Design a protein around this ligand. Structure first.
Ligand SMILES: [Cl-]
Ligand SMILES: [Cl-]
Ligand SMILES: [Mg+2]
Length: 305
């Protein structure tokens, strides 16, 4: 009950090392080596060979620990995050869909059905990197879908969309612990409704393709939801659940996710290209979506299996 200890708990940092479970290279010896590299108070395994917490000695800047740990692990596929230990477990998740919760870009997959995958995918890549603004890029790409029959959506969904590893476990585990989870996308409601329910999200919010009753018109419902719409949705969710954006973890891979990534108390650039990852305070380049559970301090024993 010491106030001296209690204040120390607030300025207390912890580093977390995280591997992909499919390339689980965080060996016990490596974790000890890393913890010695930062004069750690301790070393706590969240998942054998996959993730460990390394409490940092008080007074060490987070930037120092990050450099030290990345040096010790250089050349190993192990991610590094540093944060305050208090309030690392969040009660809101907000997650992008395309190339984040799913392996594909829904717009590029639909473009294949128009014989224009490569053309559209090149635009998608520049939009994801920040070289073109999202809304005009979305309009340009969707215009090339004009005339596709509505049956093509379920075809794409059923046959070409796959869930990113760790996604259901991430969503279901935070829900087990009382968190509210939302799938937000610059993509399309016809995809996010199905994906959200496969994974287990509480809600979804995305753009909407316009149709004439049988075929796509090649346009999107006005107004188009982009970077600010993701920020506004995080604000809306937090107010509605009686919290603030500091109580949320946000994750995405693209330039238009950086608003919600930067507003959230924990913002994660997941497998992002360098220009996007440079603008997030946390990056996961190797782990899968279970990395976000380890970020929050969950042990594998806490997971919904
Ligand atoms: Cl639940
Ligand atoms: Cl739609
Ligand atoms: Mg994305």
């Amino acid at each position: 009950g010491s106030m001296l200890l209690s204040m120390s708990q607030q300025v207390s940092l912890v580093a977390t090392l995280i591997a992909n479970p499919a390339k689980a290279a965080l060996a016990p010896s490596l974790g000890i080596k890393a913890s010695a590299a930062v004069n750690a108070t301790g070393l706590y395994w969240l998942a054998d060979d996959i993730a460990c917490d390394i409490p940092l000695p008080l007074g060490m800047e987070a930037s120092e620990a990050d450099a030290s740990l990345r040096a010790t692990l250089d050349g190993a596929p192990i991610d590094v995050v540093v944060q305050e230990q208090e309030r690392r477990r969040k009660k809101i998740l907000i997650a992008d869909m395309d190339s984040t919760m799913i392996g594909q870009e829904c717009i590029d997959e639909l473009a294949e059905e128009a014989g224009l995958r490569d053309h559209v995918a090149a635009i998608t890549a520049r939009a994801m990197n920040g070289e073109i603004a999202f809304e005009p890029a979305l309009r340009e790409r969707v215009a090339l879908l004009k005339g596709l029959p509505l049956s093509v959506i379920d075809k794409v969904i059923s046959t070409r969309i796959t869930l990113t590893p760790g996604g259901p476990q991430l969503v279901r585990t935070m829900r087990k612990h009382g968190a509210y989870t939302a799938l937000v996308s610059g993509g399309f409601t016809s995809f996010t409704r199905r994906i959200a329910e496969m994974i287990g999200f509480n809600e979804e919010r995305a753009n909407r393709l316009i149709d004439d009753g049988t075929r796509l018109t090649g346009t999107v419902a006005e107004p188009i939801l982009g970077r600010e719409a993701k920020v506004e949705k995080l604000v809306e969710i937090a107010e509605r659940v009686g919290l603030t954006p500091e109580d949320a973890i946000a994750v995405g891979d693209g330039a238009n996710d950086l608003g919600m990534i930067q507003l959230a108390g924990t913002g994660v650039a997941l497998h992002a290209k360098p220009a996007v990852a440079a603008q997030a305070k946390m990056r996961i380049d190797h782990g899968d979506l279970t990395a976000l559970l380890y970020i929050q301090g969950y042990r594998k024993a806490d997971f919904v299996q």
